[PDB]
Each structure stands twice: as structure tokens, then as C-alpha cells.
């Protein structure tokens, strides 16, 4: 619509919630492509912080031969 867009994240990434959701969504996709058990995807949903999201995928990816 011609109206002006409401609040936008153009200013800065001051919004960490959006990044947490995308980080979990992007990490979940990697499990889906590999075809791992849905349990690991569910575990990502409980990831408290992104550092745990990358380390959990990295430890799981490193665990495989």
C-alpha cells in the first residue's frame, strides 16, 4: 500500500529475537536435508542461545564420520 511501512529492522539488528528464530530455522533445515531424527530438530527448538545452535550442529556434524 502507499502508506509507509510500520517499524522496520532497517535501522539495525537490535532485534535478537528475529536472529534466534532464523538461526534455529536455518539449522533445522540442515537436519531435514540430511534426514536425521526429528528429535534433534526438536532439540534445536529448545536451544537457549545461537552459540549452542552452531556448536550443537557442529558437534553433531563432527560426530558423523
Name the structure determination technique: NMR
Quick check: helix, strand or coil at residue 54?
helix
Quick check: helix, strand or coil at residue 12?
coil
User: Which DSSP symbol is given to 3?
Assistant: S
DSSP secondary structure letters along 25-38: HHHHHHHHHHT--H
- Asked if residue 41 lies in contact with residue 28, where contact means CB atoms within 8 angstroms, the answer is yes
User: Distance between CA 57 and CA 17 in Å, rounded?
Assistant: 20
Contacts of 21 (CB under 8 A, 6+ apart): none
User: Distance between CA 4 and CA 25 in Å, rounded?
Assistant: 29
Report H helices in the chain. 16-34, 38-45, 50-63
The CATH number assigned to the domain holding 2 equals 1.10.8.40
Q: How many domains does the chain have?
A: 1
- Asked if residue 24 lies in contact with residue 32, where contact means CB atoms within 8 angstroms, the answer is no
Amino acid at each position: 500500500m502507499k502508506a509507509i511501512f510500520v517499524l522496520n529492522a532497517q535501522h539495525d539488528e537490535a532485534v535478537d529475537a528475529n536472529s534466534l528464530a532464523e538461526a534455529k530455522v536455518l539449522a533445522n533445515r540442515e537436519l531435514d536435508k540430511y534426514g536425521v531424527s526429528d528429535y534433534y530438530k526438536n532439540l534445536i527448538n529448545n536451544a537457549k542461545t545461537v552459540e549452542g545452535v552452531k556448536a550443537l550442529i557442529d558437534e553433531i556434524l563432527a560426530a558423523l564420520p
